[model samples]
Target: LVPRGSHMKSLGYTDNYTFASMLFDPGKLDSDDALNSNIIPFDLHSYMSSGNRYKIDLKLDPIIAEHVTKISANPSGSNKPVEFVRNKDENGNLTDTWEVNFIRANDGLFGGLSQYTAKNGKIELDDTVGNIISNAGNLSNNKLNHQVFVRDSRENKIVRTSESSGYFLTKADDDLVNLENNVSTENNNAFKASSGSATYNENVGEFGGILIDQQIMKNGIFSYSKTKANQWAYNYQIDKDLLPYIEGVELHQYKNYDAKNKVADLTIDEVGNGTITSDNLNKLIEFNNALPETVGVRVVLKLNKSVNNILTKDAKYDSEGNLIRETTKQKEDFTFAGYLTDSKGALINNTLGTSTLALQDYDKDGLLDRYERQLSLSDAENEDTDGDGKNDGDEVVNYKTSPLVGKPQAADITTEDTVVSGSVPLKEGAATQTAKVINAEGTTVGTATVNSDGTFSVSIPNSPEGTYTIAIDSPNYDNDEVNTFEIVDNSKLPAPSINPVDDNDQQIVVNGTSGSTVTVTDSNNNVLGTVTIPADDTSAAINVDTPLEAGTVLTSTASKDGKTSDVSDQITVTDATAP
Candidate 1:
């Protein structure tokens, strides 16, 4: 025999065993077998076995269950009830002890049982026997016995058990196996539903919740959970439901998911869906409808024909699309394409500023190839500014057409002869004039030309290939300059020849300052002899003492103060017989 409710409460709801106790008599069971032996005994045994099972009947007191559900779901509000209780007996004696304490009864116990009475006077027992039995079968399965109940403080009543689970286990209410199966199925279905609706909610730091409909399609792009019916009704370009349906139907349908094209198609659909055809038409509709009207749609027209055709197809506009020039291609193909004044709405031919000309090498070569000039039609008076016989702006220096247009002026040469040989009178400026010669390329050579008065002469040396344009400039004449003359080869000029000194010529005498050394060479510039001239009063005679080898020309040169004199006329070494 298990203990009564009061005794069980005193013993902290621990389980009890039955035996023939000496304190009580068995005649107490014989008085009312149905009430005492069957019902009461069974209930007491159940209370001892299970601690407390608080049942929550949602239908009986929905408001309490709703509040509990909200509090249980959030667990963050301070107003949630932490404990619940019910008075079992309505008698006003507080010590009569008729309340079932749910919070204290479930504390630190393996199992418990309690009764919750509904407002309809239906007594329902809540038991945790299944939890205890499950744990008893496997001690390691540390499953907790959760207490469930619904309390309506306003009505002062507690509703326990669902409509499906009655007070007793008849063949009708023996739904434990089906309830377990349904719980498993519901759990799996809940997991799938949550996964299917998985979405990021930026407002709150949670994963699962209700989403507002307005935010479903904020832009032209499809947002999360935007329904097709809503998107269509809202005049979205694309049908939201069509996208997932098409994807499920065929993988190829997803190929046209390009966001840009989809957006463009959606714009076209908003204007008119018939403009797009086939599967693409449906996609365009869906895409367009999924986008909010806040983002203005841009229409891009692809014209396969000419501009004239496009203008003919659509409403015609001006050259600048201002509806100004209105001439069909068939009637007037050549229309004036020029600037127009905004106030008068008339063509302005010469509104641009004056022209500028710049010299540039159109080709990458060093020479300036051409000139670019911007010309204003209004400035016709100053058209030929430079007076070169060409229009100022129209003149273009094209090196390829006329290479001389931008070429540098030919260099001037001042003289003819550059180097002179024997017996020539050394005139003033003769060196530069005599050295002046021309090269093959028509460029000025080594020196300048001589003046007519014999007062000056220019000298130039042999020049290399190139034009020699020499100018023989003289102060005496107005046109006293030789511009340019060509010389092909210098080898044609006579080699230098020396004149021998006659026997009657004064014997060569050497007069010297101190430490002077004199050297003598033949006409061919070969060194023949050297003599040291002493500082004493006696001058040295450099005469040919042994006179006479015929046809031998002796040349002599002298130098002092870094100045050199030209080679002297040759002295002939004559044989004694030859005259």
Candidate 2:
């Protein structure tokens, strides 16, 4: 489909009548069509005169963005729209003035629309003086003056509190026309042309128009999407040159005009030669300048908001004049933002000092790449290199622990010490952390803090003796196993008494505590036999399958509860006289 206000040269003025009638019909107008017919004030000269000054005031609330809920323009500034014109000479010109009411912007296109008219062959429009609109010619130049102001929509609903300051680059069909700025001036709330001068083009009817490109630098945020239930979405579109030290949050190109490539009238060899070298990029830029496209460098930001319910007291009282129960309502989420400030509570804007540097995670992992590199971590490589079932980013970045090291586990410990300790490798900011000793049932039995040396000694609670696991509360690390360690009473068991073995005896008897293991060995420490006492009996027999010679000495000991008793008194094999 053709553009709505395009002139059809072949069909002449009848086409304009049908097009204007079609545009004026409310029945055929789409949602984006302005409800007011005189939105652009294209034909002001027909109705606007000295006696009856015409003013077009229109509100775009129904079609504009929700963040910027309103968009209006009118001649409501300090100056009257038009003064009474009483010039006797036909060479004298009739002049009219119009000023912007408000041009609130959130996201998308917002700029001034100008039109020129001339009766003779000469025409000019100038706005170099104060906030004034003036022209000198036989015919007045019908132009509207607008200073674009981008409000930080996140400040409030229905009305915004702050506006951004930046510069606008004017382009006349891919050629740099002029630059308009308020970046380093007192008008830090809007951007407008400092001095605009326009003249007629070669053709008498055709005139020159410009496209205004906007770039902001003020420290504020504006939202575009409302995706969550008590939450809105926001992002900053900044220049990479201004943001020299790029952060590693969430960022990308916001403008599609420059993100994709625009080709021009040039050969492959003349432009890039299939590579991105410096000379090639320069040539490509120069060639693409002839193409009807504007270039913009983009840097986007990622922001978040959350919802939480909090308790609130009611003013009403009970029947007995007692206080009423407190009610719960959703509290505003904590704001996550900051600005450069001095130690004495003042905002700092040192342009030459240094650009703001934020923690970056190039790999998109939860861990910051700054610490990851200092800790010898690859920016975008393997996340969990230790392979302990946890990402290195979570371990080092979130938990303040080493990515290469695993979490603490149950290790060797004795009942005498009654303490479980392990070397927990901690990072710079997480050197001090709490570790807990948990049982198989996930019940914490002991707790301790990590020392500066990255070690922890968690003493068991109430002399606990059983299988336990180590659960370090802070500094996340890999602990994939059940990580259970056995804790037994380290006290020695009672020795077992061994019966004398005769030369012809086939077995030797030993007496000890029930459920205790008895081990029999010769004087040379060669184990002959071993047996466990029955739970119901205190005596056990060692079946010596091989016969022993007379005068062979043997000893016995008892083992129980992960402890061994001292060696029992030696007994010699006596000679049996019946042989």
Candidate 3:
């Protein structure tokens, strides 16, 4: 061995044992040269600042951390840099600027680089306000400004649509009212059809009168199914009231609508206002190919108008100049989607007061059906309004996240922080946030990426475990600090192992943590005794006479550096009859 005293990792890793794989060496290597130990940034600074900065390295004094082995202060420095300057505020006194630009962070010597400049013994460097270069400053920082505005971005769209007036608002209101009226009218027709007054039924009219003309009649007869004859009534159901009026024909079409096929042996009457006998009802069933509860209505719509298709005399006539041929087409008119209005022409349902709430609820999702659609948070009436993992109310009230997609962003910060992480609809980008871990003076202590899942985490140093905080630093987001976090020290240090066998006596021996204090609790968690493990290698010498208090099992606990170790051993002392 070259020389050795107290040493740490990477000691002689390349000596008698090492191997290399294709692109990687699965084994460890501790070389003195070539990308060896740590990725320390000391060498790189020597090559910075337009090649005009200073150079310095570290001194790992056997054991003291931050021992500042800072070497040269120049391209190599001196009581002077090989190069130096003198100026004043120094008319009476002169001093060299004696400055360097590159400073090493994480170098264990100086973590931040500051500027030193020219003049007298009293040199001054003024930084512009809000230079904000470090997070090293105590974050007990308070937000002094509370500038606020209303939808500042949307201000461009609106706030200007007016930019004035009652007329515009009134006109919009009037249009809305008219639209409401239009919808009412459409529904009113369906209501009117069910008025039972006779005629006017869409289910019967089957409207916008059909155009098929299998014109098969010399005496008002059209081709239709004999077997399907009864089912034909489904088109103009025997005598349901108000089902045959609007524009006169039925309002829809049905399968085999004209009943063109049939059992030649059966006979039936044409469609008209009347009811059916059981046999006829049975006929209806048979007509639908035995399908239960079906109808097959036959229609020969008694078309009232007729016209010649060729429009004029056929130009191509027989050799004797005789007219060739022309066909007459029968047509009828019917209305579709038409509804009755009051005599005054308004469609309002006079029976219903307009104030009756219009909301309908089926799943009782705590929201109106219409609103669910509007907010697009429909999950078949699920309580998780936004489909986020958290239930709706918790998100809205506690987490304060929106219950809808692309939930509205918060203009203010109010969420509490916790040990584990939670989520937000944070967008993925360098904007809004960086997963980098920043510290007190704004120095990036570590790094991690906030995921596409809209959540982020902060990396904290383990050395100093205590309370700390962070406030978001974004122009678009509210500068809110997360709730306080307690870095807990979970590493069980050298702590006392309980020493007690009870043995009908009160002497308890606890050992291990050389510098910690011990606490003893009875079986039911009552404090029975306490002992400083040993400012002088001690023991808990006690006197409790409450019979049980002096006899119950005692638990030992040791604490150090704000860290508490779990107690695992117990010992109880009993009152000695002799003592």
Candidate 4:
């Protein structure tokens, strides 16, 4: 019987060894022939000695069998030992052999029995022994080679020619305790449930791995699967994704869609190069209103982008949608100086030294299309403020209007008088004539009226003796004249004149009465000296000593009863000449 703990220990043995033992069990031997009897077990109790040998116990349950009937044995009592000779063939070759022993009966004088036995003689002892010895030798070899030999036992051979049967078997009893304990682990709860749920849900068209969530509802429906592919396709068609592109054209020219409709319900005209018309622009604007406000539009047209160019074409309408007036580009240069054309398109004279604007139609469209104005830099063409040719300081400008323009000349008006003298006289019963009088400084002094005869008489205040030019002018006629007048003091003594005494028949003596009057005067009517005549009748010769010097002209006048005599002739007075 197998030992109780041998089932666990029997894991070391395989089916090939069990099959070999079944074919060669020594315990089934039956005959008494020593060569065919069962092999006795031996106990080589090595533990009491060197501990190297096995302490083996052997026993037999049965010893009779058909295959062991031809076996023989050797005697045990002899002075010579029982030589258990090994078996050999006729050619001197060695035959199969097993353990042989001398069995002695239990007699006092004899030792033990000697028995010779063979086990598995036809199976070849070298085959079994060589297999055991080779396996024992290969324990220190490379483990992979040894394991390969164990896995395939047919490849294992002895040193000579020998072979053995081979088989494989799994262990009957293996502990599955850990594998069973892992069945109900809490760690696998989520994995198991999720895996099962995924499988079940996947069968019902519910994707589990990395999919867009369909739980989100927009306008009461889940739309996770609806990509923007259709919208992008529509946009691409409208945008002309493959067309050769040009800028400056608005987007609305190609695409028109009603934003109020959820579907793409608009059609587009084929892209082409066409001139922009008013009808086309109006249609674009009307179409633009139908689309979303966010949709931008652009239109390309030939336009004059220069600031110096202007449009001169007029707008025209026709029954058919066609533009009659084509835009034409024209450039003009403008100046800011010179005579400006008025609204009536007439050139007007402008003042000098002032900024003047002139307009000209450089494009000649019957309009003042350009403007120019100039300022005088030098006095030669200075701005005549009064619109006269002369400057403001030299003349006054008479204007039909307050500020004059165009061909108005400056007038030199008289502001000062040419002559000024005595007070003018006013005649009786004559019309009064007013005079515009100006002083020497060209300032208006006063206005004097004269009589109709053009004469004026008036007292003049006391004034110094000096020559003055007096002017008389009348408003009634062109009567203007200048007179030279002088002032003097009349209270001074009369000027004296000297006369010579002539002797005809009488002696050359002073025959005039004494203290007779003698008057003397200098040039410029200034009185110099005077002398009085004497009153005695007998003393008729009166010596008149005056302050008059020689070369002075003195006059002596004698008067009685308001009758005056002739003036005395001038005489040269001298100290050496006697009277």
Best by lDDT: 2
lDDT for every model? 0.24, 0.33, 0.27, 0.22
Candidate with more favorable, higher lDDT: 3 or 4? 3
The better candidate by TM-score, 1 or 4, is 1
For model 1, where is the 10-residue window of minimal lDDT?
Answer: 190-199
- Tens digits of lDDT, candidate 1, 1-579: 111222111000111131100000011111222222221111110111123343221121111111121111101112222222233323432111122322223431112222211111111222222221222322111111111223333344333111010111112212221222233211121110000000111122121111111111121233223234322111111122112111111101111122243233212232221122232234423333344321111122222222122112223443433221222211101000001121222211211111001112222122111111111111112322322233322232211111111111111111222332112222122122222334555444345344322222234453343455433332322222223333334322211122333444334433222233455666576554555445332123355554434566776554434544454445565443322
State in Å the error of residue 330, model 4: 64
Model 3 residue 466 distance off true place after TM-score fit, in angstroms: 2.3
| TM-score quality measure for candidate 1 | 0.13
Instruction: List TM-score per model, in order.
Output: 0.13, 0.25, 0.19, 0.12
Pick by lDDT: 1 or 2, better one? 2
Tens digit of lDDT per residue, candidate 4, span 443-525? 44444554343333222333343333344543332333333332223222212223332222111122222233444433434
| lDDT tens readout by residue for model 3, 198-246 | 1111122233222211100011121223333332222112211113321
Ten contiguous residues with the weakest lDDT in model 4: 192-201
> What's the C-alpha lDDT at position 142 in model 3?
14
Candidate 3 Cα errors over 4 Å, as ranges: 1-365, 369-380, 384-394, 397-399, 403-449, 452-457, 460-464, 468-485, 489-579
* Model 3: lowest-lDDT 10 consecutive positions: 160-169
Q: Compared with the true structure, what per-residue lDDT tens digits does model 2 show for residues 1-579? A: 122322111000011111000000011111123222212221110000011111112111111111121122222121212211111112333112111222212111111212111111111112121111112111111111211121112221111111111111112101111111111222233211111111111111122111112222222221112223322111122222212221222211221223233322211222111111221233222212323221221222211210000112122334543223222211111111111112222222211010112223333344333334434443333455544445554544344445554455433333443556444433333424577777777788778776664455676644456777766554433332124555555453556666646788898877665567889888898989899877544556788677789999988888878878777767788785421
